Amino acid sequence: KNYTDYFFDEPAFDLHDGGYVPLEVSDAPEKPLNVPPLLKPDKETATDVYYTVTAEAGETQLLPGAKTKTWGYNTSLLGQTIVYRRGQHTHVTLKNTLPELTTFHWHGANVSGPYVDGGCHAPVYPGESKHIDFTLEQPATTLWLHAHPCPSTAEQVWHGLAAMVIVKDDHEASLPLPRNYGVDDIPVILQDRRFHENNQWDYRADYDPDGVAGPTAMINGTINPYFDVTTQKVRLRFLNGANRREWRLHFADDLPFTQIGGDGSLLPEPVKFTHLMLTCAERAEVIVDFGQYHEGDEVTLYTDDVPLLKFRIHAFKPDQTTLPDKLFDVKAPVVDPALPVRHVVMQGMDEGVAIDGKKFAMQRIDATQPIGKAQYWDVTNSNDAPGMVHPFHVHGTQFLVLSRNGHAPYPNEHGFKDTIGVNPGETVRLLVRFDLPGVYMYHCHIIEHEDGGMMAQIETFDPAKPKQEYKLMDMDTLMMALAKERGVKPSEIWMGGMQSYEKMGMKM
Numbered sequence: 001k002n003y004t005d006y007f008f009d010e011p012a013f014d015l016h017d018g019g020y021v022p023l024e025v026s027d028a029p030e031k032p033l034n035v036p037p038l039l040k041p042d043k044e045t046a047t048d049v050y051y052t053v054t055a056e057a058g059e060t061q062l063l064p065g066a067k068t069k070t071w072g073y074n075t076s077l078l079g080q081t082i083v084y085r086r087g088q089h090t091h092v093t094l095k096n097t098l099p100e101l102t103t104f105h106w107h108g109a110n111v112s113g114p115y116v117d118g119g120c121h122a123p124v125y126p127g128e129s130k131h132i133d134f135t136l137e138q139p140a141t142t143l144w145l146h147a148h149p150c151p152s153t154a155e156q157v158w159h160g161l162a163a164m165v166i167v168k169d170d171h172e173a174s175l176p177l178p179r180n181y182g183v184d185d186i187p188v189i190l191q192d193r194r195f196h197e198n199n200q201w202d203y204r205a206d207y208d209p210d211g212v213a214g215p216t217a218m219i220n221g222t223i224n225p226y227f228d229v230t231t232q233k234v235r236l237r238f239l240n241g242a243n244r245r246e247w248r249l250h251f252a253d254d255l256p257f258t259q260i261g262g263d264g265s266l267l268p269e270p271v272k273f274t275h276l277m278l279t280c281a282e283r284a285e286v287i288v289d290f291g292q293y294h295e296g297d298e299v300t301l302y303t304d305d306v307p308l309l310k311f312r313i314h315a316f317k318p319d320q321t322t323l324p325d326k327l328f329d330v331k332a333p334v335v336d337p338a339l340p341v342r343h344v345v346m347q348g349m350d351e352g353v354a355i356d357g358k359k360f361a362m363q364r365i366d367a368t369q370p371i372g373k374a375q376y377w378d379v380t381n382s383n384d385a386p387g388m389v390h391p392f393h394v395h396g397t398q399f400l401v402l403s404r405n406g407h408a409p410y411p412n413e414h415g416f417k418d419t420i421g422v423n424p425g426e427t428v429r430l431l432v433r434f435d436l437p438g439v440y441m442y443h444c445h446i447i448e449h450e451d452g453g454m455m456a457q458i459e460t461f462d463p464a465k466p467k468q469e470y471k472l473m474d475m476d477t478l479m480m481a482l483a484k485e486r487g488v489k490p491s492e493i494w495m496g497g498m499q500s501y502e503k504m505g506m507k508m
């Protein structure tokens, strides 16, 4: 009924790592949580919407003293929240005003690959504009935008390129959920950073091939935030946007909250928690009820023993409303019995990370699957011992979770998901269908692992057609371009991920 324990295997948690960086409460003064504005469309009708999404360098006051140099989408850090709607024709102008190339990846959006998907093979160069057009046919959910060059995605997310994407549909608009964005429905983008001299970031100084975590939590680009509650119920859209950290979320007083949404859909039924764990790139939407609190009270959201976000309780209109027993009808696609069970094995830690025995190669296709055909994917984490949880992510689909070592999925995994935490020794079985042809990455979403090789890619295809040609990114193109952009020789260019490739004697 009420889940008081984190689901993942406790001995594998990040906090047992030899080089774990605990979070430390910053000295900085507490302040209102930043809620990113809603990106104003250029233009909108019932059928169409037009946006311009602009990657940009700038500065952001994060700590007392100097501004921290940051990157962002239509703002200096993170990004304004982008809203998309099932069935609506969407036109996005991607505009790079940074000094380096970037990529615009719509994490969890079921769009064509490899260009609209905006992964490794979709560079936008400084000064360039690219136009994309798509229509999403997927249920309401919380997705996100982040940068995806291969490598280094980790550098560009650390700089600050991430933004929440909200997907609306008609069914979700019929439900009795908080939805007044910025008042009772808010992003809780969870991140960490380490601040250095003059409050700057230095990804390189902090590089660790097993995952970069700093001591200072940063929620929606804010240090020591607090939220003014003016409603009995608040909807929190949790996003783990850290490069590696696991968030182990729970309130003072064990105040319960009820998860209503996962990565790719509403959950079929609400699930009540007191303690909720999220690995990288996972989303969880929860409803918190503040009815048992007096005006003037204060409630604190923690991760482990560390306070993250304070809820200040003001006067609120009482709210009767209960959630229905059924939020969402999961229609599971159908597996053709003549397909194999695909088996995908994540191996290694630190610099040794790999999938199915190999590190990612941007030019090499690792797998194929025909479109419109669901297949069972067995996904294994080989790590022994106590080891670690790797969050596995697949571009271009939302899957369903069928089993964890032959037993039931976790209670909040009965809806659609694009990212899944896999414990050491574990095999999760997934039901994976790709509606669109293209090239799509699959990988660990600990971002240093991804950059450091724990990545592969699948070509999805129409079996009624000849093989397609895709211009794939090559490493020489990337390093000439970054060399020109930084004003250096290709041989002095540094990128997060290189060290993992170099040390195992492997060619990026």
Ligand SMILES: [Cl-]
Binding pocket: 061, 062, 063, 064, 065
């Ligand atoms: Cl300040």
Ligand SMILES: [Cl-]
Binding pocket: 486, 488, 492, 493, 494, 495
């Ligand atoms: Cl460099």
Ligand SMILES: [Cu+2]
Binding pocket: 105, 106, 107, 108, 393, 394, 395, 396
């Ligand atoms: Cu993705």
Ligand SMILES: [Cu+2]
Binding pocket: 353, 389, 390, 391, 444, 445, 446, 449, 454
């Ligand atoms: Cu990993």
